[PDB]
């Protein structure tokens, strides 16, 4: 009975309260297998649309970073009521690439009972940090959310990519969890590697007024992962028109030059009848970059003027940092908009200054946090959170994936939290 988030807000709490009014629930997409441990789950992908979901993960054996990749799972399924008015993910279609080490940065979109996942094939490693030697290859997988008993190519299909339109950018790659559909058009979040020498930037355009420790070129050398990097990363969308022809063009739409930061994991989601774009803050500006989409093509995003939600960085770029300094660091903590009247959004954000830890589900306004709830302990390390809100039996429910590496586990996996936006504000 899970549907998309539409209509007016009815029977919730949208005022600031200090009481523990939020009750998260530990849901899971599958039952854990007994007597199994010693593997680490990395690069998670959770995308939600019209009661359907997709998940993707790289399960490795041993070290979380450079162990042996046990499997890569890209699976779609239905989001159903689990029995006690709580939504849990139910996987139906599962696919495993034959080379899990070459698949990076998948990006998942629903359109008409299929789920299109666009990933990057790379025999050179991660296409962000050694992008100069990257081929530029991508892959599109069609997974049926309803798999028939004998469908063949309907259940799992590999759509061949032949026509790539990218313009001035040297290469493009899908760089985010979830995109949108507009009729028959898929808009994945993506990034474009431009060369640094042709990057047109006015060095007097970026704001350096309030901070006395910032040279006014730092806004341009912070646009890549290194100050001397060959490529800059410009975020945006990748457009796939499914009625374009036999081989559709995959067209890169660059983001608007307003509030320009580095290309980071972004996500465009259709909330309350309109697209909302969230670009992660992997740069000097650590306040949350998300806002309304004025035009999908070309990508113009009316960013929120948010002052209370930020991200935990590292040294030299902490939380709540606003001065332009050279840094490529940060975490993906997305926010899903649940009320367009006051622009109230809900998402899991980490609540430490220099450390990626303490995941808190926060429902917040533009310049005020309404109410928060701790998902784990204060010193529990969390890395990347993906929140998607929806309507189950006319109740607003937000399913959140958190990269919780809590102490005492013999197996490492993201935790799935179903958090109802509470009916009564007391």
């Amino acid at each position, epitope marked *: 009975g899970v549907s998309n988030l539409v209509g007016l807000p009815n029977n919730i709490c949208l005022q600031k309260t200090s009481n523990q009014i939020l009750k998260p629930k530990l849901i899971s997409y599958t039952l854990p297998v007994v007597g199994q441990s010693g593997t680490c789950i990395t690069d998670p992908l959770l995308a939600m649309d019209e009661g359907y979901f997709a998940y993707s993960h790289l399960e490795r054996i041993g070290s979380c970073s450079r162990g042996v990749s046990k499997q890569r799972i890209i699976g779609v399924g239905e989001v159903l009521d689990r029995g006690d008015e709580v939504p849990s993910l139910f996987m139906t279609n599962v696919w495993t690439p034959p080379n899990p080490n070459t698949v990076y940065h998948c990006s998942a979109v629903y359109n008409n009972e299929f789920y299109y996942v666009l990933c990057a094939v790379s025999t050179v490693g991660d296409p962000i940090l050694n992008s100069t030697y990257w081929s530029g*290859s991508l892959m599109m997988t069609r997974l049926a959310v309803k798999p028939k008993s004998n469908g063949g190519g309907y259940n799992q299909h590999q759509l061949a990519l032949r026509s790539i339109e990218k313009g001035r950018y040297d290469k493009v790659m899908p760089y985010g969890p979830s995109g949108i559909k507009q009729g028959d058009t898929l808009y994945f979040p993506a990034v474009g590697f431009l060369v640094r*020498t042709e990057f047109k930037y006015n060095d007097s355009n970026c704001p350096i007024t309030k901070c006395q420790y910032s040279k006014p070129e730092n806004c341009r050398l912070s646009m890549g992962i290194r100050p001397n990097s060959h490529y800059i990363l410009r975020s945006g969308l990748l457009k796939y028109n499914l009625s374009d022809g036999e081989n559709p063009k995959v067209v890169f739409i660059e983001i608007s030059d307003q509030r320009l930061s580095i290309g980071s994991p972004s996500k465009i989601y259709d909330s309350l009848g309109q697209p909302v774009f969230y670009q992660a803050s992997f740069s000097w500006d650590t306040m949350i970059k998300f806002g309304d989409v004025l035009t999908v093509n070309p990508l113009v995003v009316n960013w929120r003027n948010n002052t209370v939600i930020s991200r935990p960085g590292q040294s030299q770029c902490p939380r709540f940092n606003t001065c332009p300094e050279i840094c490529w660091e940060g975490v993906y903590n997305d926010a899903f908009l649940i009320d367009r009247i006051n622009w109230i959004s809900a998402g899991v954000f980490l609540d430490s200054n220099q450390t990626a830890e303490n995941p808190v589900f926060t429902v917040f306004k533009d310049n005020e946090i309404l109410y928060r709830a701790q998902l784990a302990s204060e010193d529990t390390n969390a890395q990347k959170t993906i929140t998607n809100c929806f309507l189950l039996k006319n109740k607003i429910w937000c399913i959140s994936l958190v990269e919780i590496y809590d102490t005492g586990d013999n197996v490492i996996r993201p935790k799935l939290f179903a958090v109802k936006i509470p009916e009564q504000c007391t």
Partner: antibody
Amino acid sequence: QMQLQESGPGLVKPSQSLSLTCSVTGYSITSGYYWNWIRQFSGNKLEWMGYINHDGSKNYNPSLKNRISITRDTSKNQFFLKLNSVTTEDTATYYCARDYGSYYYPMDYWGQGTSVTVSS
Amino acid sequence: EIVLTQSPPIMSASPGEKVTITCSASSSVTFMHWFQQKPGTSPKLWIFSTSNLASGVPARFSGSGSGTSYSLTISRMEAEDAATYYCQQRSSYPFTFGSGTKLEI
């Protein structure tokens, strides 16, 4: 959809500069592809003359680096191949093409080419 | 200049039989594009990357190969496949081509 049209003198005297203009209709030079010249001789053997990038960076064949110049005009949306010294071994058909360089998806679209004859 | 060479310089194929055309490189190359050219017609990109068929290319064509040896394979050649196939490397400048035509019978 776009088209590339080559124009220039078919008959060129030896030791004289050879000029070709490839006009582009339906796409912009400064926002897009790598624009190459490729030469195919009387025997069916293609040789990559060079390219001009969309930004203006110019790359040439090292076997031709002393004679070739591939410039461009954005207002007329067309790009020019100039050969400073031309011998009788340059009697060949010339194609102007667009692609994406060493990218995984080149999408080579080639013009029909003009057969430049060098004789006296 | 990496110098590619195609082993059967004038391969002959009777129609309907499996046919394979090989391109050999002087050094290691990551990619090997395959261009089809008919007489009185500019060459068209036929198999980009290594095994990826281009737009409009029939499914009978199949690219293969790794390192310095690459292959173009047609399972069931028809009458429309009598052309000239070239291999192009784009790993290191300059870009280089080959030769090699087809026959009807």
